[PDB]
Design a protein around this ligand. Structure first.
Ligand SMILES: COc1cc(/C=C\C(=O)NCC[C@H]2O[C@H](CO)[C@H](O)[C@H](O)[C@H]2O)cc(OC)c1OC
Ligand SMILES: COc1cc(/C=C\C(=O)NCC[C@H]2O[C@H](CO)[C@H](O)[C@H](O)[C@H]2O)cc(OC)c1OC
Lengths: 103, 103, 103, 103, 103
């Protein structure tokens, strides 16, 4: 088992780490159609999404995806500093696999 | 894949962007039969709803409608500024498809 | 399609608007069998309930009842002002059908 | 239907009211198997539990047991004053049946 | 039934109590497949996880695992002081069984 987000991320293909050390600038949520988009941005211009549970996700996934959307909403509202994101780089915007919060 | 609410909104039919840049003025919630719904207003007089699911949309669409009502409630309670709403034009009050929050 | 709580409340036969324009004074919650309910009061002495979900309710009605209890708890704890309640008056305490929150 | 926690308490055998008028001093929860429970204390030393779900509980109580643990956690974190607890006294720690919050 | 977290911890093999008396320093969560977990750290360096759900868990723990992750996220965001953790010491990071918050 990995002990931090950087190690976790490296277990996967098509992932990298972004280091933000900043609060979320904007939060966007859609209920429309299949994609039900959740989009976060940072003041540096970085943009990320959370993808809906879909054909590419195994069943344990479903709850973790909902949780991650919950986390991003509360993080945004509380102005909590995001340390790092682990993202899939083969989607645009890059899709969030994990988040760390510190400071 | 869109990267912001304006581009997301343009993919949908008979929608439009309202730019509020304001916190929500009032929040209304009903549990009464077949009117299980939520209405928000803004100080400029604008009124919007989260539509009742019906029995016709699918399970993930259900979850997203619940999440949107959760978002509106917490936005209202925290006085979070709503940047834009993407809404369908064919209902009165207009039904919300998406929301962005930013300062 | 109603646009505010007063017009929603008017759709029904046994309902009435109460105008509080005040924070909730007390919040009570029970897990005891057949009394899985919430009760709120205001400083003017008014008492209202969220009804026990029985076998008469369908899922979406049970979901909206759970949402209403969630709303009332966080309204209590944030000292949010309650504008109006739509209640069924054929129950003691009167049972909540809808809530509106505004300053 | 009862209009307050005292009257609700009295509908059940093996219960009593404790009047705290104080915030929760500590909050404990467990995911360990067969000990999926919460425990709260007050500054005067008094200990109370939310029981592990079991054969004593009817199905309607399962959502309410979860809701109670959610209420105790957020009451704790917000330092909300607990007015009264209705507890079963045939268990140690005494088992929460209902809570009221007021100033 | 145990009266406090220390006594609860003593009922299980491969556990120990850590007394932190400190806020959470960092919070990490993942949605990545087979790593649907959370990781927290303290300023003293200690690392803990909420395990991926697995064949070690019984059905009654599934809700409590989700709850614990909720707990840890909101504790972190509110800077709540963690008093003690009860953890399984046969895993790295050590796996959370129970948490107490006080002071
Ligand atoms: C089965 O035991 C009794 C049932 C009843 C009647 C019905 C019932 O529904 N009781 C629930 C009580 C039990 O569940 C509660 C949670 O819901 C809680 O855990 C209580 O500690 C437990 O006794 C009355 C009794 O004394 C006169 C009983 O003796 C202990
Ligand atoms: C380690 O295996 C033992 C199991 C048992 C019996 C029950 C048991 O361990 N239950 C759950 C422990 C496991 O699940 C936990 C989550 O619930 C958690 O993941 C733990 O790390 C894991 O060991 C007894 C032992 O000592 C005599 C054991 O040590 C060899």
């Amino acid at each position: 088992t990995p002990q931090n987000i950087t190690d976790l991320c490296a277990e996967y293909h098509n992932t990298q780490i972004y280091t933000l050390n900043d609060k979320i600038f904007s939060y966007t949520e859609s209920l429309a159609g299949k994609r039900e988009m959740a989009i976060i941005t940072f003041k540096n211009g970085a943009i990320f999404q959370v993808e809906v549970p879909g054909s590419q996700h195994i069943d344990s996934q479903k709850k973790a995806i909902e949780r991650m959307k919950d986390t991003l909403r509360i993080a945004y509202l509380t102005e909590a500093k995001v340390e790092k994101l682990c993202v899939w780089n083969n989607k645009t915007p890059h899709a969030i696999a994990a988040i760390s919060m510190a400071n």
